[PDB]
Design a protein around this ligand. Structure first.
Ligand SMILES: [Zn+2]
Length: 310
């Protein structure tokens, strides 16, 4: 079958863009690498945060719509998004969360210690220390390369049918089974980031779509050719798959897996530096060219916000 390097990006519906940004840039120190709009709804932001380069495996993306049409975290969703930091950096993050009045808990699984906390709109996050994965050199506030979030450590999936999700991850998608512990089976992809995928083995009841939930998880393809191969393979192995959609910073295909999680395969190229320079990406509102004749309509409707140090 096929083999993905790991997570490309994760996409979530959240609340006010300023609140979202104050958390992901202000607290977590991630770079806003692209501000654009939702391809489907031009009157809604689509914000992309990541490491200094917005590299695949570091990219968290948001549809911020203020007013919180709140969903419920449950089966058929990514339950927890995992962020990896350098070895020894746990205390930096614990003290920083405390400074910002963000409660956290400490849990252990598979011999690793995790800091668990929620973002302002209810998404479940965690931080884990690992040597693997390139340092994030985006300096923002007190966040420096020796402590900065390097990207995703992985994610924890809540599946309506965990046996089917496991079969997909291991036997179709080429992830290696690490083992089982507690209520989890763990899988590892071959990349050095976005690579540790935990699957909860007992269903906790179906989630509800809406704000404060993860919308989908995207897995990496090396290039357009690899993605086309994925489309052919996935469609012939028991799933519905969309046509390729050009999202400007990558091409995308989507398929809902049997545990009801929405998966995506996204190409590593071209990335976020091809309609803005690497040094300025994230600074201007970029639009799908189809909407450039409505820039006035579009901007008039978007809430202002700024990336700011807290
Ligand atoms: Zn996506």
């Amino acid at each position: 079958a096929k083999k993905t390097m790991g997570i490309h990006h994760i996409t979530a519906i959240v609340g006010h863009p300023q609140e979202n940004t104050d958390f992901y840039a202000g607290v977590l120190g991630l770079r806003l690498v692209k501000q654009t709009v939702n391809f489907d709804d031009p009157g809604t932001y689509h914000l992309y945060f990541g490491n200094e380069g917005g590299k695949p495996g570091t990219i968290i993306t948001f549809f911020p719509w203020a007013g919180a049409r709140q969903g419920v975290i449950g089966d058929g969703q990514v339950g927890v998004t995992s962020y990896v930091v350098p070895k020894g950096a746990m205390a930096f993050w614990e003290k920083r969360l405390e400074k910002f009045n963000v409660p956290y808990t400490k849990i252990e699984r598979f011999g690793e210690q995790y800091v668990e906390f929620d973002d302002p709109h209810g998404l479940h996050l965690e931080i884990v220390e690992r040597e693997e994965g390139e340092a994030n050199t985006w300096t923002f506030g007190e966040v420096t390369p020796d402590v900065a979030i390097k990207g995703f450590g992985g994610a924890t999936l809540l599946s309506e049918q965990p046996d089917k999700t496991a079969d997909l991850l291991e036997n179709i998608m080429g992830l290696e089974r690490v083992g089982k512990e507690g209520d989890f089976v763990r899988y590892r992809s071959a990349g050095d980031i976005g690579n540790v995928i935990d699957l909860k083995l007992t269903p906790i009841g179906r989630g509800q779509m809406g704000a404060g939930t993860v919308h989908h998880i995207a897995w990496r393809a090396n290039d357009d050719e690899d993605q086309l191969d994925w489309q052919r393979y996935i469609a012939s192995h028991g799933y519905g798959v969309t046509p390729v959609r050009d999202r400007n910073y990558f091409n995308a295909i989507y398929f809902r897996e049997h545990g009801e999680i929405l998966f995506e395969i996204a190409t590593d190229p071209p990335g976020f530096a091809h309609d803005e320079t690497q040094e300025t990406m994230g600074e201007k509102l970029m639009l799908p060219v189809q909407y450039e004749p409505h820039r006035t309509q579009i901007e008039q409707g978007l809430l202002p916000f700024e990336v700011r140090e807290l």
